[PDB]
Amino acid sequence: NMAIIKEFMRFKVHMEGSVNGHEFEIEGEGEGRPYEGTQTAKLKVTKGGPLPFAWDILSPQFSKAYVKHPADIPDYLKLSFPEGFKWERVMNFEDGGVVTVTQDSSLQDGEFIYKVKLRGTNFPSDGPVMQKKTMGWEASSERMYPEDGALKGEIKQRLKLKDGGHYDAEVKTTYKAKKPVQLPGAYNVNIKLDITSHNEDYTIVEQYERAEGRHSTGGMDELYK
Amino acid sequence: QVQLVESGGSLVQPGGSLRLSCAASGRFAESSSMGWFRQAREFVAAISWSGGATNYADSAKGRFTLSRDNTKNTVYLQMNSLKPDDTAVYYCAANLGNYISSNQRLYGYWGQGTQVTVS
Ligand SMILES: [Cl-]
């Protein structure tokens, strides 16, 4: 009973990282409804705070078990549990900033356990990340496809800026089950991540995400599966 | 696609035992987690696609056992200590999301049912 995916699941997360050489750690806890595609988390900076950069570059690194999938697509990442999966991401921002991430996901004692390692580099001094001028992510579409025995996703991800401008990243992620799992074909995932509350210096932050997979081929019949 | 074919329903005596089967076929049979529901629908027990996790409704725990032959994508529900009120049509259903709990709406593929009578 401590090794299955219930309709309500909690998670714990630890992140160690650096951005432009500034080392930090985060610990958090979350919860959500994996088959509905919804989740929330509360994150706390436990080393290196206050962070001298925008929280928003970290927020997408805190949970793909909580994606609502069509009934006729193998839910590769759910299927990988309890052992779980690993993911690796590269984000290329339009001003030369780069974020690379690796992550381990497992199911232990009835909760998901996430361990994240992050390296952000080359953010410019007069850009919005190092000056905390961002204001959350627009909804995204992640184009998923199998490749080389893993599941890949690509996103053109748009960060809102306080001045009404926008700031784009190109993102690629590899998601790989720890044991062999049947891979899906290509499909898309619609995602929206919100920061629902935070303290003044973003050392305590609450997030919400909704994510839903959809077929990208198959005509009307493959809609709303 | 996943197709499910059940077998094994029979008449047994009170206190008796039976073994039901459900064979999954189709492109996603290897990824099919299978759950049994009975309709006199109510959850009975389920087993993950890998055969490695099982979950039993309260009334089934300790007297029923589920197993999976991964080479045939077939599951077996061994029912012991059966009583008249276990009489029902037993359905097996499947999902591709590693779900083995009681919400029937999370199983999108259904077998045809098999009749168990205890009397
Ligand atoms: Cl390939």
mmCIF file with all atom_site columns, N, CA and C in Angstrom, chain A residues 19-20 25 37 42 51 59 61 100 107-108 125 134 142 144 148 151 160 163 166 172 177 188 192 196 213 216:
data_model
loop_
_atom_site.group_PDB
_atom_site.id
_atom_site.type_symbol
_atom_site.label_atom_id
_atom_site.label_alt_id
_atom_site.label_comp_id
_atom_site.label_asym_id
_atom_site.label_entity_id
_atom_site.label_seq_id
_atom_site.pdbx_PDB_ins_code
_atom_site.Cartn_x
_atom_site.Cartn_y
_atom_site.Cartn_z
_atom_site.occupancy
_atom_site.B_iso_or_equiv
_atom_site.pdbx_formal_charge
_atom_site.auth_seq_id
_atom_site.auth_comp_id
_atom_site.auth_asym_id
_atom_site.auth_atom_id
_atom_site.pdbx_PDB_model_num
ATOM 1  N N  . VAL A 1 19  ? 23.318 29.143 -9.218  1.00 0.00 ? 19  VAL A N  1
ATOM 2  C CA . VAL A 1 19  ? 22.982 30.007 -10.341 1.00 0.00 ? 19  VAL A CA 1
ATOM 3  C C  . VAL A 1 19  ? 24.059 31.078 -10.398 1.00 0.00 ? 19  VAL A C  1
ATOM 4  N N  . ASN A 1 20  ? 24.764 31.154 -11.527 1.00 0.00 ? 20  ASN A N  1
ATOM 5  C CA . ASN A 1 20  ? 25.863 32.089 -11.713 1.00 0.00 ? 20  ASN A CA 1
ATOM 6  C C  . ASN A 1 20  ? 26.837 31.992 -10.537 1.00 0.00 ? 20  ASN A C  1
ATOM 7  N N  . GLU A 1 25  ? 20.349 25.657 -1.445  1.00 0.00 ? 25  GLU A N  1
ATOM 8  C CA . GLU A 1 25  ? 19.589 24.432 -1.278  1.00 0.00 ? 25  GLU A CA 1
ATOM 9  C C  . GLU A 1 25  ? 18.157 24.811 -0.977  1.00 0.00 ? 25  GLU A C  1
ATOM 10 N N  . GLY A 1 37  ? -4.076 15.555 -12.642 1.00 0.00 ? 37  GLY A N  1
ATOM 11 C CA . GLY A 1 37  ? -3.081 16.471 -13.161 1.00 0.00 ? 37  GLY A CA 1
ATOM 12 C C  . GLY A 1 37  ? -2.886 17.726 -12.345 1.00 0.00 ? 37  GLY A C  1
ATOM 13 N N  . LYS A 1 42  ? 5.009  23.592 -1.289  1.00 0.00 ? 42  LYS A N  1
ATOM 14 C CA . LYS A 1 42  ? 5.597  24.656 -0.489  1.00 0.00 ? 42  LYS A CA 1
ATOM 15 C C  . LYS A 1 42  ? 7.087  24.378 -0.419  1.00 0.00 ? 42  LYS A C  1
ATOM 16 N N  . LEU A 1 51  ? 17.875 34.272 -2.286  1.00 0.00 ? 51  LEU A N  1
ATOM 17 C CA . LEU A 1 51  ? 18.478 33.993 -3.576  1.00 0.00 ? 51  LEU A CA 1
ATOM 18 C C  . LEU A 1 51  ? 18.615 35.297 -4.353  1.00 0.00 ? 51  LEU A C  1
ATOM 19 N N  . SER A 1 59  ? 11.083 27.297 -10.475 1.00 0.00 ? 59  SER A N  1
ATOM 20 C CA . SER A 1 59  ? 9.759  26.724 -10.257 1.00 0.00 ? 59  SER A CA 1
ATOM 21 C C  . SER A 1 59  ? 9.433  25.526 -11.123 1.00 0.00 ? 59  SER A C  1
ATOM 22 N N  . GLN A 1 61  ? 11.230 23.129 -11.866 1.00 0.00 ? 61  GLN A N  1
ATOM 23 C CA . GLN A 1 61  ? 12.017 21.965 -11.499 1.00 0.00 ? 61  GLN A CA 1
ATOM 24 C C  . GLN A 1 61  ? 11.450 21.210 -10.299 1.00 0.00 ? 61  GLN A C  1
ATOM 25 N N  . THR A 1 100 ? 20.642 23.908 -16.501 1.00 0.00 ? 100 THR A N  1
ATOM 26 C CA . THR A 1 100 ? 20.641 22.469 -16.671 1.00 0.00 ? 100 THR A CA 1
ATOM 27 C C  . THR A 1 100 ? 20.273 21.829 -15.344 1.00 0.00 ? 100 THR A C  1
ATOM 28 N N  . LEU A 1 107 ? 9.223  6.360  -5.373  1.00 0.00 ? 107 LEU A N  1
ATOM 29 C CA . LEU A 1 107 ? 8.098  6.266  -4.449  1.00 0.00 ? 107 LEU A CA 1
ATOM 30 C C  . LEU A 1 107 ? 8.606  5.501  -3.237  1.00 0.00 ? 107 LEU A C  1
ATOM 31 N N  . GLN A 1 108 ? 8.610  6.146  -2.061  1.00 0.00 ? 108 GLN A N  1
ATOM 32 C CA . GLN A 1 108 ? 9.073  5.546  -0.811  1.00 0.00 ? 108 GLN A CA 1
ATOM 33 C C  . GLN A 1 108 ? 8.089  5.860  0.314   1.00 0.00 ? 108 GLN A C  1
ATOM 34 N N  . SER A 1 125 ? 23.985 40.430 -16.223 1.00 0.00 ? 125 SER A N  1
ATOM 35 C CA . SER A 1 125 ? 23.733 41.340 -15.114 1.00 0.00 ? 125 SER A CA 1
ATOM 36 C C  . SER A 1 125 ? 22.526 42.233 -15.340 1.00 0.00 ? 125 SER A C  1
ATOM 37 N N  . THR A 1 134 ? 10.997 39.147 -13.251 1.00 0.00 ? 134 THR A N  1
ATOM 38 C CA . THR A 1 134 ? 10.058 38.207 -13.858 1.00 0.00 ? 134 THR A CA 1
ATOM 39 C C  . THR A 1 134 ? 8.780  38.093 -13.048 1.00 0.00 ? 134 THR A C  1
ATOM 40 N N  . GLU A 1 142 ? 4.135  21.193 -23.951 1.00 0.00 ? 142 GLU A N  1
ATOM 41 C CA . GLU A 1 142 ? 5.310  20.342 -24.045 1.00 0.00 ? 142 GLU A CA 1
ATOM 42 C C  . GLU A 1 142 ? 5.035  19.243 -25.051 1.00 0.00 ? 142 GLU A C  1
ATOM 43 N N  . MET A 1 144 ? 5.877  15.911 -26.559 1.00 0.00 ? 144 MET A N  1
ATOM 44 C CA . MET A 1 144 ? 6.507  14.696 -26.088 1.00 0.00 ? 144 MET A CA 1
ATOM 45 C C  . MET A 1 144 ? 6.717  13.721 -27.240 1.00 0.00 ? 144 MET A C  1
ATOM 46 N N  . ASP A 1 148 ? 15.455 7.053  -28.290 1.00 0.00 ? 148 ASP A N  1
ATOM 47 C CA . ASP A 1 148 ? 16.615 6.411  -27.688 1.00 0.00 ? 148 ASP A CA 1
ATOM 48 C C  . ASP A 1 148 ? 16.256 5.768  -26.352 1.00 0.00 ? 148 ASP A C  1
ATOM 49 N N  . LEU A 1 151 ? 11.718 9.047  -22.913 1.00 0.00 ? 151 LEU A N  1
ATOM 50 C CA . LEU A 1 151 ? 10.682 9.977  -23.337 1.00 0.00 ? 151 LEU A CA 1
ATOM 51 C C  . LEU A 1 151 ? 11.263 11.380 -23.331 1.00 0.00 ? 151 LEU A C  1
ATOM 52 N N  . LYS A 1 160 ? 6.825  35.769 -18.188 1.00 0.00 ? 160 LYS A N  1
ATOM 53 C CA . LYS A 1 160 ? 6.305  37.129 -18.151 1.00 0.00 ? 160 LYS A CA 1
ATOM 54 C C  . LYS A 1 160 ? 7.273  38.006 -17.391 1.00 0.00 ? 160 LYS A C  1
ATOM 55 N N  . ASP A 1 163 ? 7.638  44.406 -16.614 1.00 0.00 ? 163 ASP A N  1
ATOM 56 C CA . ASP A 1 163 ? 7.409  45.567 -17.477 1.00 0.00 ? 163 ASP A CA 1
ATOM 57 C C  . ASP A 1 163 ? 6.472  45.298 -18.687 1.00 0.00 ? 163 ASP A C  1
ATOM 58 N N  . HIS A 1 166 ? 8.221  39.990 -22.363 1.00 0.00 ? 166 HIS A N  1
ATOM 59 C CA . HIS A 1 166 ? 8.278  38.550 -22.161 1.00 0.00 ? 166 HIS A CA 1
ATOM 60 C C  . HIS A 1 166 ? 9.684  38.081 -22.483 1.00 0.00 ? 166 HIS A C  1
ATOM 61 N N  . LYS A 1 172 ? 14.494 21.398 -23.491 1.00 0.00 ? 172 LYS A N  1
ATOM 62 C CA . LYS A 1 172 ? 14.412 19.990 -23.831 1.00 0.00 ? 172 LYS A CA 1
ATOM 63 C C  . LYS A 1 172 ? 14.690 19.182 -22.581 1.00 0.00 ? 172 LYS A C  1
ATOM 64 N N  . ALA A 1 177 ? 12.673 6.047  -17.357 1.00 0.00 ? 177 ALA A N  1
ATOM 65 C CA . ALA A 1 177 ? 12.319 5.116  -16.306 1.00 0.00 ? 177 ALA A CA 1
ATOM 66 C C  . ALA A 1 177 ? 13.551 4.348  -15.871 1.00 0.00 ? 177 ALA A C  1
ATOM 67 N N  . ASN A 1 188 ? 1.084  15.713 -26.637 1.00 0.00 ? 188 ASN A N  1
ATOM 68 C CA . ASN A 1 188 ? 1.402  16.996 -26.038 1.00 0.00 ? 188 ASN A CA 1
ATOM 69 C C  . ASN A 1 188 ? 0.895  17.069 -24.617 1.00 0.00 ? 188 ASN A C  1
ATOM 70 N N  . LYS A 1 192 ? 0.180  24.602 -16.831 1.00 0.00 ? 192 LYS A N  1
ATOM 71 C CA . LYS A 1 192 ? 0.213  25.950 -16.287 1.00 0.00 ? 192 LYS A CA 1
ATOM 72 C C  . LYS A 1 192 ? 0.678  25.874 -14.845 1.00 0.00 ? 192 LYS A C  1
ATOM 73 N N  . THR A 1 196 ? 1.432  30.783 -6.128  1.00 0.00 ? 196 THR A N  1
ATOM 74 C CA . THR A 1 196 ? 0.208  31.184 -5.450  1.00 0.00 ? 196 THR A CA 1
ATOM 75 C C  . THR A 1 196 ? 0.461  32.052 -4.231  1.00 0.00 ? 196 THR A C  1
ATOM 76 N N  . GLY A 1 213 ? -2.199 15.784 -20.541 1.00 0.00 ? 213 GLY A N  1
ATOM 77 C CA . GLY A 1 213 ? -1.824 15.298 -21.834 1.00 0.00 ? 213 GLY A CA 1
ATOM 78 C C  . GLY A 1 213 ? -2.978 15.192 -22.784 1.00 0.00 ? 213 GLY A C  1
ATOM 79 N N  . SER A 1 216 ? -1.850 14.387 -30.051 1.00 0.00 ? 216 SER A N  1
ATOM 80 C CA . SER A 1 216 ? -1.540 15.350 -31.087 1.00 0.00 ? 216 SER A CA 1
ATOM 81 C C  . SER A 1 216 ? -1.805 14.792 -32.485 1.00 0.00 ? 216 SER A C  1
#
